[PDB]
């Protein structure tokens, strides 16, 4: 579980939108398995605007935060499950560390801000979906 709260903005893992998500939404995208919908509070995280390739994750199943060096945002092959079948999903960053299902959410951060969530996992390996071109999310 986990959210970014921007503005009047909520970002969540598409797979995990609730109902009240989806009533109030704003963009989805299934191949980077993101969706944003509106909110009545005003959030106060910073988005990154960065090509930080180095930033500390949350993970849940640990109660621990970690450093970690990731990917460039690319298309990498997801496996099929109960929310996708087997496609590649855009956006994607990799990171030798712990992630296992139910810690989609976990923030991942820079120096300079938020720069995705925890959307994939398995291996050794953790996924995060990249937020930093969406730059709608400040304005
Ligand atoms: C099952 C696995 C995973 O990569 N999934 C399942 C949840 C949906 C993911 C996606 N982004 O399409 C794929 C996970 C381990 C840890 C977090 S999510
Ligand atoms: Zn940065």
Do not use: K, M
């Given at each position: 579980?986990?959210?970014?709260?921007?503005?009047?903005?909520?970002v969540?893992?598409?797979?995990?939108?609730?109902?009240?998500?989806?009533?109030?939404?704003?963009?989805?995208?299934?191949?980077?398995?993101?969706?944003?919908?509106?909110?009545?509070?005003?959030?106060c995280?910073?988005?990154?605007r960065?090509?930080?390739?180095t930033?500390?994750?949350?993970?849940?199943?640990?109660?621990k935060?970690?450093?970690?060096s990731?990917?460039k945002?690319?298309?990498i092959?997801?496996?099929?499950?109960?929310?996708?079948?087997?496609?590649?999903?855009?956006?994607?960053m990799?990171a030798?560390?712990?992630?296992?299902?139910g810690?989609?959410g976990?923030?991942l951060?820079?120096?300079?801000?938020?720069?995705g969530?925890?959307?994939?996992?398995g291996?050794?390996?953790?996924?995060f979906?990249?937020?930093?071109?969406?730059?709608?999310?400040?304005?």
């Open positions: 579980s986990g959210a970014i709260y921007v503005g009047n903005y909520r969540v893992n598409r797979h995990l939108a609730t109902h009240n998500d989806w009533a109030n939404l704003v963009w989805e995208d299934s191949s980077r398995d993101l969706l944003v919908s509106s909110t009545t509070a005003q959030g995280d910073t988005i990154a960065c090509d930080c390739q930033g500390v994750y949350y993970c849940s199943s640990r109660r935060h970690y450093p970690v990731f990917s945002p690319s298309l092959f997801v496996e099929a499950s109960e929310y996708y079948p087997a496609r590649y999903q855009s956006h994607l990799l030798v560390g712990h992630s296992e299902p810690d989609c976990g923030i951060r820079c120096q300079h801000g938020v720069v969530i925890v959307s994939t996992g291996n050794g390996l953790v996924g979906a990249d937020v930093r071109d969406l730059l709608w999310l400040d304005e």
